[model samples]
Target: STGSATTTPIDSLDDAYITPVQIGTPAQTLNLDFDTGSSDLWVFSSETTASEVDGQTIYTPSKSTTAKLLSGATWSISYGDGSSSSGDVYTDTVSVGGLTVTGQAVESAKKVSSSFTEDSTIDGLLGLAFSTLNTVSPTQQKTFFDNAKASLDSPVFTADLGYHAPGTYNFGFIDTTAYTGSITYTAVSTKQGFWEWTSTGYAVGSGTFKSTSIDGIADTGTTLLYLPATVVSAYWAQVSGAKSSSSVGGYVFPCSATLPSFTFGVGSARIVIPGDYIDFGPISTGSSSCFGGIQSSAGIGINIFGDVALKAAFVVFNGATTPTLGFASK
Candidate 1:
């Protein structure tokens, strides 16, 4: 049937979110990160090497009578952070909050990278991006949402990422009370398996909004806002003590300097990222230097409206066809 879910913010990091998901027959529950950048329902399980499992809670297929092997299936994934995990596949029933999808492919990680192996909080990742990005070999796998879309009253999900506070991810429905004003919807292209959209333009402070085109992805997994070199340069120039520090890997500004707010035009929606958000945090100890939240997207060739940008507004990732993004101020 139809249902929705609320996601809890991961402690300390406050960057990503994790929600409880039930997998297999006896319904083995695991805390998983709901990622909008990639598509893969993978988890740390008994297959994972004991030494690499670390503090993450593992899922055991043998405990579930419903777990069935995918028969020669395998999966491998590499991320920008160098964290990776891969292993054999299984078919089982999966549920997130009140939503459930039967016969879903669940990839178990037999091998995990150092990044993931050391992470004690994130047990797995529940990818919400388009199913086309699923990494299952031999045959592509469908995302939990993709397979359960028909069961939803409407194909939609809302990401309410709070600031160092609790937030919820509502599946299949938009909770109007979670946000304020109206939602400005924009067209999304799933060619890259992300909730990607083209922004009308962007500007710093209270300057005139230019009519430039910027193609970017709304990535919850990413922590900072990544813009074009020109855009990042323009914004950093406005800061009196800001300088590009190759050692820091991004522009750093004097913590005492007054930072300006950055704004982006998403279709008709004008989303504003406040100045305080730009000052990320202190670059080092005993120093007044602070890293900027806006960095260059030179490596990826496209802008990324990450958590720093998304948290400024209420985001709606609609899956009801053509995949659109709706944003509004909280």
Candidate 2:
């Protein structure tokens, strides 16, 4: 079992989220969002109703000899954002990178929204993020890690997310070389996959904020880094052109300039987020101007240190190890 790895289970909002292997092929590559907020792997299907299926990438079973559909099972999922989709259950033998897992459950959506349907590049979302609000029952539930864990070289799974690039969210085997030393693990909190802990204080430019500790959570589902108002204002002051623009929901600046780097002290670890994240351009109107990341949710109920915080280090989730959060490096 030197290299054999398995997934770590996490609970967020009382829901379970496990990193799983995803597969697509020469025609379709295995790409997933790895969200813990929802359950199910939804892909576009060929047998979908034309009206509902329009503008989305449909996965054709005929194209892949390995793809198999479930018998008479239909599924529908709705998001808090008012997005919804309906589909049928299917099973397939899937491979991610070099690892292969068989009998993987997948959802083939016939209907999806313009946000999903219109995007030709995004095939589907692998919801590894946790949320207790899932409609799928435990008996009927299937997650990416649940099936893939049996086949991985290790029972652990890690996510290496890069900024807006082709292979940003790299998955599969955990690479320990990226960390300073052997992986350090934290016991899974009873609350779930959301990394719930007390923030001793904020650290800016290698300095710590006045507050010693504040309760917080780490989430990948959220795209931005939400911090306290005082912290947000203090951090923004360092950047020359940094300004809160009406165009973007959070603080933003021109991307051309180099911005300051800020680190957050989460327990003993100092999580860093680059300033470039604060200067993202407009992806669309009405939609919050994309900051490479943002500091909006200040005063919000919970401080969410999103993917913006995660990109700083390698994180491993060990479900096989009785639900633990392990950190490593590239």
Candidate 3:
């Protein structure tokens, strides 16, 4: 853990973001997603079968002088989005931005789902959630954030996720100049190692804010904002021609029409995601119809405040006994 601020540049991947990370002694670079939705730092490895690897950059621990195999340690994880990966563990030096974590647990995948194998740009995932959620056994693994907390100037980090543009993920410090207003802090209710919080309420477009509190988790790995099925239906009612499409999946509306902004309440602070942001671009090529970015995660069981929600504000994911989330409009 380093006390100094290590700012990592985030590249927009349409849905999620990726940042370069150096692992092992000689520093083999990998494009990894800093995911708050997961707790295991897993990567494509030499252990994977050639046919399973696809275009992913495989991490060869044997090439590193500091690499040590965690004998008999193995892991398997399946994401809510249906993406999955499984493999063994290796202890090695892992660095992001510039700060390095010594002897970090790195999951080396021998098997990966089609979702990961087809996504050649993403080499791995670096978990930003609580350490207790790591999948490695006979003991759980510590996330890089948890491992480096003691050395940090502050046990907090800020995410500046953007749409079709570059952003930054800052650790150990808060850059006040990044946002336009003061950050409002809210108490985090962690049930299963997630940065979960209850919003004061939300409103669609310019409608009056409903005080009905909704629970959600801040997720960087996910792309869209997902609420309850009822909430999703209510919002779409305001959009003319918008309806749930089975072929396209989720709600679709007219491309030429302007959409109403979606606003969520965080305690006393209210952040609004503009109409353009709500429209995630056309559903497909040459189509005049566009898919709504905010949808229902009815089956997933948890509402996710994904890139659409996070990008609308500057967020501080704090690690504490009573972990809290701070939000400021960017």
Candidate 4:
């Protein structure tokens, strides 16, 4: 509920959202979005005809004098939001902060729509997620991390969300200056496309489901967390005097009592969910309250832990190195 909405205009072509970021040597400033749903690094290019480079941000590589285009390969990407762009593959010297990586694969949109042309700030996307979700082929690919993994003192990376500002999510090797103690890591599950997770149990107030099992995927692209109806109902049952409100979604509850905490056990790590995450907002239908973060995605067999859950922990995606993942505290 305490999230900030980016007022940046969405691309008309594909509703592509944009965020500002620094890339390459001398830190070329560019606008990009942090997309976890897909893995593809794309940017608008000046060489691209004006007709093809419309609403997106085009990187003027000619100014850099250090960019190279990949021959005999094409690149294209489509997002769940319905926006897409495609072009030839190329590599360049990319740098951010004090870290620089060479031979980085990037895409130049040769064909674009008016929607992408409309937004001026909308430049490109910096996908820091998984390679499995990559829109392009990974067999002949190398991401920002992939190119820089060897240069790093530790092959580990960490993300800091609460730094600079609230929406300030930083990437690169975890700055040891920000934290002390050994960093905890979680092994990657070679499953399907999404970052799937297994839950140990659901906790309501002080009560917890020791035997109950809830498994689902975690996606940063999503804005909310969805759970099955049975699991939501069972969670509400434990809250004393708590009743479901129909005004909101039936899953949402409005009791004057304090709800218990829930912990998601991922391998050896335990992630705790605060009570506010349970009071998901209201719904228009039925008298039953709709849970805030948990919805009745029953039988869907797939539940996603979106940004609401991701913001609670430090996540590091290590696609640059071996197929592994890293996690730490904020």
Instruction: Supply every candidate's count of residue pairs whose N, Cα or C atoms clash at under 3 angstroms.
Output: 0, 38, 0, 32
Better of 1 and 4 by lDDT: 1
lDDT of 2 by residue, 132-165 (tens): 3334433365566656556556656665555442
User: Candidate 1 — which residues are off by over 4 angstroms?
Assistant: 11-13, 284-287
In model 4, the Cα lDDT at residue 31 comes to: 75
TM-score of 1: 0.94
lDDT of 3 at 309: 91
Candidate 2, which segments miss by more than 4 Å at Cα?
A: 1-30, 48-56, 62-68, 80-82, 130-134, 137-139, 150-153, 164-173, 181-184, 190-200, 209-218, 240-247, 254-258, 282-292, 298-302, 328-330
lDDT of 4 by residue, 176-211 (tens): 555444445554554765545465555555664454
Worst ten in a row by lDDT for model 2: 8-17
Q: Please list the Cα RMSD from the true structure of every candidate, rounded to 1 decimal place.
A: 1.8, 6.5, 2.0, 7.1
Model 1 Cα shift for residue 198 (angstroms): 0.5
lDDT (CA) for every model shown? 0.86, 0.57, 0.86, 0.56
Ranking by TM-score: 3, 1, 2, 4
Q: Pull out the clashing pairs in model 3.
A: none
TM-score of each: 0.94, 0.74, 0.95, 0.67
Preferred candidate (lDDT higher): 2 or 4: 2
